[PDB]
Amino acid sequence: VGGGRLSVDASDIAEASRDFGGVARAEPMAVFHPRAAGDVAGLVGAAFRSARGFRVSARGHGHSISGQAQAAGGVVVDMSRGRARALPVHSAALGGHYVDVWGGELWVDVLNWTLSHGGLAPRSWTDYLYLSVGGTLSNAGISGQAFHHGPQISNVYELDVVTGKGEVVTCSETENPDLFFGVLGGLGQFGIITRARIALERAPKRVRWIRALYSNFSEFTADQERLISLGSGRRFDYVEGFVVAAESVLYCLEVTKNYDDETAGSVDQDVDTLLGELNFLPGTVFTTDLPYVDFLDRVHKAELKLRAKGMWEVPHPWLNLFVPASRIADFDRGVFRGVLGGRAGAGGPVLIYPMNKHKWDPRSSAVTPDEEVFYLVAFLRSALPGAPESLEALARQNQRILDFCAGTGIGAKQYLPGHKARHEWAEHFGAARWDRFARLKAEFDPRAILAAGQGIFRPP
Ligand SMILES: *Cc1cc2c(cc1C)nc1c(=O)[nH]c(=O)nc-1n2C[C@H](O)[C@H](O)[C@H](O)COP(=O)(O)OP(=O)(O)OC[C@H]1O[C@@H](n2cnc3c(N)ncnc32)[C@H](O)[C@@H]1O
Ligand SMILES: O=C(Nc1cnns1)Nc1ccccc1CCO
């Protein structure tokens, strides 16, 4: 336990009993507030040595949908609560800068820290910055930059991990690689990340942010696929998209072009040349020019508007799927024009954009479809508050989408999976990856103390 403290404070318990999903409510016995990595090791070590064992889960910002950060009758480690920060460091071997961050650090605070110490910033993002480093690294961490730099799990040099035996282990591609690759995308199963060594680049100053409309899905996806194949060279720095509710279906392409004081003179010509090659509906180009930080933090501004309208602290029955590019047209037909019938019926934004599998290390625990180009399709649903029928309808719509994928053999894979059924986890991973996942579990968390809320292994 060391410098850290155990808390049975009512508000601490209440927060550790809830997440962004707003449904799962498993209460821990206590909330642990560590001062350092050693405190986390002491607590996990005490759980591993105890006769009965007890559940231990790290909580980042509690952005999980289905109780993944919850520890029923156990201890929730509040990693993100404020508790010495390492400055960025340049390596001539890596050919750039890295920075060591506490595992519970929010990406927003990492960004503010790196910009203030050399105008540096991480290369790979999430659309929302109030997420912990350990939380997104336990999943993948994706946004519109992932097609080029890969997800956040492809932009980490090293980790310190407290295993399910309470041992502090430093790992990287060349040091304890099984733990390193096991933890990256590992759903908190093999240890708690107390340190992550993040790749950095010189941050641009400004962003040209563009949106354009399409009515033809083949032309929309052909343009997204062409844009993500660039830069192997003139390209957009971010590529996303979303399905537009008409109240015939519309699609919106979202791209950006980053610039600084030096490149400001070529930005307008670069954007025009890239747009001139696209097939969006004429006269539907919407442009904004804004500082880099303001673009990165755009989702937080939307959050503030939702909180003011009492539309933030509502159930969020999200569904995030990775769909192979070869079946994206069938998905659009079956889901966007079928299950949804072209209708707001989704209960929130429906994001759609492709990524390149080659930017994803095949050794990590992350599960992607068995194809080079795949899409993220994100149903970012909000149920109406006080309306149980709203959550029932959206949960049923998620089940139909999964049933349509399984029924038509679309090799889709859930991102942030909420399976909680043995044969379904085995189907999610596939034979070879499941055997490796189970073997890593026997090695690093044999008692299944960690991240029991994921519902993969039988916990104490
Ligand atoms: C709420 C939300 C989530 C979100 C998003 C926008 C919002 C409003 N935008 C995302 C995006 O653009 N791209 C992306 O990849 N994910 C996005 N998300 C989802 C988000 O990544 C996940 O919710 C993720 O879980 C991170 O959120 P958070 O940091 O709050 O973590 P958590 O929910 O508490 O715990 C998640 C799991 O990881 C384990 N855990 C937590 N910290 C650690 C450490 N340090 N080491 C190891 N495991 C850890 C938890 O126990 C849990 O299983
Ligand atoms: O939640 C968002 N983006 C938001 C925009 N406005 N409110 S949320 N993304 C997300 C959420 C969960 C998983 C993956 C993703 C990445 C999609 O790029």
Instruction: For the chain, give the secondary structure using H, E and C.
Output: CCCCEEECCHHHHHHHCCCCCCCCCCCCCEEEECCCHHHHHHHHHHHHHCCCCCCEEEECCCCCCCCCCCCCCCEEEECCCCCCCCCCEEECCCCEEEEEEECCCEHHHHHHHHHHCCCEEECCCCCCCCCEHHHHHCCCCCCCCHHHHCCHHHCEEEEEEEECCCCEEEEECCECHHHHHHHCCCCCCCEEEEEEEEEEEECCCEEEEEEEEECCHHHHHHHHHHHHCCCCCCCCCEEEEEEECCCCCEEEEEEEEEECCCHHHCHHHHHHHHHHCCCCCCCCCEEEEEEHHHHHCHHHHHHHHHHHCCCCCCCCCCEEEEEEHHHHHHHHHHHHHHHCCCCCCCCCCEEEEEEEHHHCCCCCCCCCCCCCEEEEEEECCCCCCCCHHHHHHHHHHHHHHHHHHHHCCCCCEEECCCCCCHHHHHHHHCHHHHHHHHHHHHHHCCCCCECHHHCCCCCC
CA of 320 to the centre of ligand 2 (A): 9
Ligand-binding site membership of 415 (annotated): yes
State the ligand closest to the CA atom of 318: 2
75-92 burial, b if ≥16 CB within 10 A, otherwise e?
A: bbbbbbeeeeeeebeeee
Query: Half-sphere exposure of 362 toward its Cβ, with a 13 Å CA cutoff?
Result: 7
CA of 79 to the centre of ligand 1 (A): 12
Residue 193 Cα: closest atom of ligand 1: 46
The answer to whether the CB of 351 is under 6 A from ligand 2 is yes
Helix pair angle (431-444, 422-429), 10° resolution: 110
CA of 60 to the centre of ligand 1 (A): 7
State the ligand closest to the CA atom of 152: 1
**Residue nearest (by alpha carbon) to ligand 1 atom 15:** 141
Do 79-204 and 205-415 fold alike per CATH?
Answer: no
The answer to whether the CB of 110 is under 6 A from ligand 2 is no
In the structure encoding, which two tokens stand for residue 241, read together?
Answer: 């998209």
| Amino acid (one-letter) located at 290 | L
| Selection from 308, 385, 320, 397 nearest residue 355 by Cα | 320
| Amino acid (one-letter) located at 140 | A
Backbone angles phi, psi at 45, to 5 degrees: -55, -45
> In sequence order, what are the residues at sequence separation of 6 or more whose Cβ sits closer than 8 angstroms to the Cβ of residue 454?
68, 187, 188, 189
**What CA–CA distance (Å, rounded) separates 66 from 224?**
31
CA of 240 to the centre of ligand 2 (A): 11
- Way the structure was solved: X-ray
Domain at 1-78+447-460: CATH code: 3.30.43.10
Burial class (CB in 10 A: 0-12, 13-18, 19+), 246: exposed
Ligand-binding site membership of 68 (annotated): yes
Ligand-binding site membership of 375 (annotated): no
Burial class (CB in 10 A: 0-12, 13-18, 19+), 176: middle
State the ligand closest to the CA atom of 142: 1
CA of 156 to the centre of ligand 2 (A): 21
The answer to whether the CB of 299 is under 6 A from ligand 2 is yes
| Amino acid (one-letter) located at 307 | R
**Residue nearest (by alpha carbon) to ligand 1 atom 52:** 69
In the structure encoding, which two tokens stand for residue 214, read together?
Answer: 């399409």
Backbone angles phi, psi at 365, to 5 degrees: -75, -10
Q: How far is CA 267 from CA 93, 203, 240, 290, in A?
A: 32, 16, 19, 13
**What CA–CA distance (Å, rounded) separates 426 from 267?**
48
**Residue nearest (by alpha carbon) to ligand 2 atom 8:** 299
Active-site annotation holder among 78, 105, 240, 332: 240
Q: Where are the domains of the chain?
A: 1-78+447-460, 79-204, 205-415
Integer-rounded Cα Rg, in Å, for the chain is 22
Q: Residues lining ligand 1, judged by CB closer than 6 Å?
A: 20, 57-64, 68-69, 79, 103-104, 126-128, 131-132, 134-136, 138-143, 187-188, 192-193, 416, 451, 453-454
**What CA–CA distance (Å, rounded) separates 322 from 118?**
36
Catalytic annotation present for 127 = yes
Total residues belonging to the chain: 460
Ligand-binding site membership of 132 (annotated): yes
> How many other CB atoms are there within 10 angstroms of residue 271's CB atom?
19
Catalytic annotation present for 63 = yes
**Cβ(185)–Cβ(365) below 8 Å:** yes
Q: Cα 37 to the chain's mean position, in Å?
A: 23
| Selection from 138, 14, 107 nearest residue 450 by Cα | 138
**Residue nearest (by alpha carbon) to ligand 2 atom 5:** 299
**What CA–CA distance (Å, rounded) separates 331 from 406?**
12
**What CA–CA distance (Å, rounded) separates 201 from 116?**
13
Residue 59 Cα: closest atom of ligand 1: 34
Ligand-binding site membership of 62 (annotated): yes
CA of 126 to the centre of ligand 1 (A): 10
The answer to whether the CB of 302 is under 6 A from ligand 2 is yes
**What CA–CA distance (Å, rounded) separates 14 from 380?**
25
**What CA–CA distance (Å, rounded) separates 26 from 40?**
21
Domain 79-204 has CATH 3.20.130.10: no
Vertex 197 angle, CA 196 and 200, to 5°: 130
**What CA–CA distance (Å, rounded) separates 171 from 20?**
31
Residue 141 Cα: closest atom of ligand 1: 15
321: left (phi over 0), alpha (psi -120 to 50) or beta: beta
Q: How far is CA 338 from CA 82, 331, 334, 378, 381, in A?
A: 47, 9, 5, 17, 18
**β-bridge partners, 89:** 98
CA of 20 to the centre of ligand 2 (A): 13
State the ligand closest to the CA atom of 130: 1
**Residue nearest (by alpha carbon) to ligand 2 atom 2:** 127
Domain 205-415, CATH number (from 3.30.70.360, 3.40.50.300, 3.40.462.10, 3.40.50.10420) = 3.40.462.10
**What CA–CA distance (Å, rounded) separates 317 from 315?**
6
Q: How far is CA 366 from CA 90, 107, 113, 140, 322, in A?
A: 29, 20, 28, 7, 11
| Selection from 314, 383, 380 nearest residue 351 by Cα | 380
Resolution as reported, in Å: 2.0
